[PDB]
Amino acid sequence: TSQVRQNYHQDSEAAINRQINLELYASYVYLSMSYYFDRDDVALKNFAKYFLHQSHEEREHAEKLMKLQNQRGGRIFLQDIQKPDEDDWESGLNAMEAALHLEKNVNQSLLELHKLAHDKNDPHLADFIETHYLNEQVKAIKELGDHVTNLRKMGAPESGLAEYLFDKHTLGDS
Amino acid sequence: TSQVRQNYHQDSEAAINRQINLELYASYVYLSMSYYFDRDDVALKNFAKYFLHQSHEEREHAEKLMKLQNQRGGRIFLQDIQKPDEDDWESGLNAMEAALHLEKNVNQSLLELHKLAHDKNDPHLADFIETHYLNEQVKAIKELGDHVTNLRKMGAPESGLAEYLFDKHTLGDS
Amino acid sequence: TSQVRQNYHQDSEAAINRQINLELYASYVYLSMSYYFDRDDVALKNFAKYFLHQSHEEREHAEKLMKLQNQRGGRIFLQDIQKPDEDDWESGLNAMEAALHLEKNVNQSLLELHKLAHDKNDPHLADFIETHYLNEQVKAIKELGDHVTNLRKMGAPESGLAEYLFDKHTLGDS
Amino acid sequence: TSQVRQNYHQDSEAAINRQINLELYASYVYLSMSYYFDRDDVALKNFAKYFLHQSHEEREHAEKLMKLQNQRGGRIFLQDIQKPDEDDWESGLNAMEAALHLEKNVNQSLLELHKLAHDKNDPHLADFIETHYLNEQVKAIKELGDHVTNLRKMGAPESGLAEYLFDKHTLGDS
Amino acid sequence: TSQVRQNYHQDSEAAINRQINLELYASYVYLSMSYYFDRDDVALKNFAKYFLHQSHEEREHAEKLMKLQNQRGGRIFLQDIQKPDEDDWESGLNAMEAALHLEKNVNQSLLELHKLAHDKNDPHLADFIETHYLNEQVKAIKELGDHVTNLRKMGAPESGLAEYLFDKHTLGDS
Amino acid sequence: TSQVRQNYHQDSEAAINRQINLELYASYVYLSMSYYFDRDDVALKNFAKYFLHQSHEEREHAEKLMKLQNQRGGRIFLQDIQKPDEDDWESGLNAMEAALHLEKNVNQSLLELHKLAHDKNDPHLADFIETHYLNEQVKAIKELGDHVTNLRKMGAPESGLAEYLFDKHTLGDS
Numbered sequence A, B, C, D, E, F: 001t002s003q004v005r006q007n008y009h010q011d012s013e014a015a016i017n018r019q020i021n022l023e024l025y026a027s028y029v030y031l032s033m034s035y036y037f038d039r040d041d042v043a044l045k046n047f048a049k050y051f052l053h054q055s056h057e058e059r060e061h062a063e064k065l066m067k068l069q070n071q072r073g074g075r076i077f078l079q080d081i082q083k084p085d086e087d088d089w090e091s092g093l094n095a096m097e098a099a100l101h102l103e104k105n106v107n108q109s110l111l112e113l114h115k116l117a118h119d120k121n122d123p124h125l126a127d128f129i130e131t132h133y134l135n136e137q138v139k140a141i142k143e144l145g146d147h148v149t150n151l152r153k154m155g156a157p158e159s160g161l162a163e164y165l166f167d168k169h170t171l172g173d174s
């Protein structure tokens, strides 16, 4: 057992390892989406750029969790990163909706990790979760919901004009 | 009675107190609208930004009136700020039309305050009204009417595409 | 029901709406006080400046809560902003004491909102409260208590010299 | 009883006073170690510099707690600062191990102070602990464990060459 | 079938998809290694930094292949990223040797992809491989072999002093 | 016995160890006072700032003595730092008078340490005392006496106005 461990339950250690796999999964989903919008029969550069940013952000999420595992004295165990459910993401609107489902899934996973940390009276772990994950999740969810709302009111996905313009006017400056 | 008072009728003092309450009311209306466009099921950032600016401007209007009350020797009496008529503002076009009605209401209130000041032969009060309120009202009214006209010719509120584009191209730079 | 809502109790939603009304109320109290010190028969510019700053800060508090309501998926409902208990604030010392009572009231309201969020196992809401409200309350309370102590040891409110000097030497640079 | 106190248990007040004494104790331990490495028969400048930094950091920890006591309305009571267990710290490796034991002790003390604050439903106190102490403890513990590991793999304390080189290559730039 | 495809065999398309999975695998291996050196019982920051750089470089390799797939008209199909063979990488020397085996594996895969492209008379694909992969592989292999040689001549992995010094003097500036 | 020792009596070594404990004691006294003026029922920021500066200066005094002990070949032995006589310092005037008593005590201790060094014909030790302690003591004593005189002529401690103004006009710029 390691010299820095203190107040660190094994249930928490397992949970962090599960969360690492989840954040890498999300990274892979977003990479898949990004390059779907790179296809010559979709060709929406700013959708592609948007989801590529999200994919690198989730990779950083995963790395912060791994640093945390080592900080608290736990051992990293890595597992396979399952492939996204889809290879074809249909449309900008549909990709954004899958991103909404994804982030809500990841959010309930964090909220249970927080439940877990408060119940094993691990306040350091709890505040780590609050400070570095919980509000980033709320922000990501509000943002993807704003986008789904605008794509819908424009006429997406029935109107290809709507997705083109959304790509130029909303994902062209941030 | 106060040492600086001169040529300041009590009807005018009451009127300024009424006008303070009105300008705070307008501030509250615009705050309500601003955050309606912040909702994830409306998501029009630049509408929200537009009405938030107007709300801070009306708060400054109110403060200038309070400074004026104290300048002329009158006493400030504050009252409740009634809630906006609506919690849901339907659409960008409808919000803009409510803003037009609002500013015309506030304008007739100022025009009667000016009537009042000219009839109690208070030229300082009269020129205060002309210089700091009357033309700001005419400008605000022309501006909101321009906007209602453009939203209508675009197809608002039936076309969600129209409101999206108006938010990007007219309220995105000023 | 809205697409971004997750782990957000309706008791919490109601509570945020109550807290918004409270922070706007505080804003109105401080505006009232500010312009009482602007009167020609009180004439304490730096008291006025002090309470005007506090009033704009409480308006920002309210806006942050409204942004939060929309972020978590809740609906904003606004209510009347009741008028301050007083129109005449007697003196700098008395105004400062009313400000102390006010901030303690607002603080117990936040502490119950936090109780509520921890009991509905809403850690995002809980950390929002800790990070953006709780310590600002402790700071505001210590500050107003320091001031009440100094005004008292100087001879306020019996000595008008004391309030004059406090206005020049303590509220003249910060 | 003081005018700023709210939601501040007397058990918490006592606890902060205990924690102040503990953080000053740690400061004294590190000062002792620092100047042990200053001895002409040890002469490891960067060990000395390392532990002197830690000693000033613990003094700042103590001061932040005292500011907090006064902020929440409590009264500071100071006690004797007991002398370090040792006057002779044997070696760089041994000093680092005593520093590891020390910080773990201080950490369990903070974790109980947090337990205490959550149980007396003092969220301001709880978030203070999370934000300003808990993660600084985890960082300090990981750091001292990294160092103990490297000194051991080098051949410390049997090899005086190992400690010399560690002092030059690990504690010579940070 | 897609409008940009020309001279692009389906065997090549499959091969690029296999190579994408391989470059992501390598990325995962290096991430695993990086954070093994982050452990408090290994604590070799510059090994960790070294393998983390390699892991981000392999992620860029994968992305360049995906861009290429879309450029030539092929369709991206993603698969699971299998976990590294080990969770514990034993030592700096052993990690470096696994990195050598890895890059040679990836290199023979590229050399067969090139064989394939020259035999389906796809010169664009062939020169892509030469310009963006083949020489990066030769460089990576020479580099890891240099390192394995130096760690061995120093006394690794039997001497923990050797790995410490290698981490400071060879992976501390590049 | 140590290789650098020359002309260094054991009575002197003991004396330096006593003086180290004394300078740390003074540091603790001043910290106690500083945070007494931080209390919300005293609230004299510049008194607090004044005594906090003095407390860090005495900590530096102690460290210079410890460096000197090691320089001359002596061994540092640390002891408990006794708590200040008081937890409540009554008033600015009273705190300043306790500071005067304190510095005179420390001064006679240095003057005996100098007596001791001249009698064991240790001129290096003697000039160290003259150059780094004796005149700093005379300066500190004149300064605290100036302050006690001004607080008294103002009406302290009977007049809380006097202490307020002294805090603003004498301890507000130096």
Ligand SMILES: O=C(NO)c1ccc(C(=O)NO)o1
Binding pocket: B118
């Ligand atoms: O503008 C006027 N005063 O400034 C004014 C209004 C009505 C009359 C009047 O009585 N005309 O016969 O004058």
Ligand SMILES: O=C(NO)c1ccc(C(=O)NO)o1
Binding pocket: C118, D118
């Ligand atoms: O009594 C309880 N469960 O039945 C309980 C113990 C600790 C807590 C808690 O975490 N309060 O914030 O609740």
Ligand code: NA
Binding pocket: A127, A130, C127, C130, D127, D130
């Ligand atoms: Na927290």
Ligand code: NA
Binding pocket: E127, E130
């Ligand atoms: Na070529």
Ligand code: NI
Binding pocket: A023, A026, A058, A061, A106
């Ligand atoms: Ni994430």
Ligand code: NI
Binding pocket: A118, C118, D118
């Ligand atoms: Ni709890």
Ligand code: NI
Binding pocket: B023, B026, B058, B061, B106
């Ligand atoms: Ni107006």
Ligand code: NI
Binding pocket: B118
């Ligand atoms: Ni006329």
Ligand code: NI
Binding pocket: C023, C026, C058, C061, C106
């Ligand atoms: Ni507030």
Ligand code: NI
Binding pocket: D023, D026, D058, D061, D106
């Ligand atoms: Ni500490």
Ligand code: NI
Binding pocket: D169, E169
């Ligand atoms: Ni070297």
Ligand code: NI
Binding pocket: E023, E026, E058, E061, E106
């Ligand atoms: Ni590669």
Ligand code: NI
Binding pocket: F023, F026, F058, F061, F106
């Ligand atoms: Ni001294």
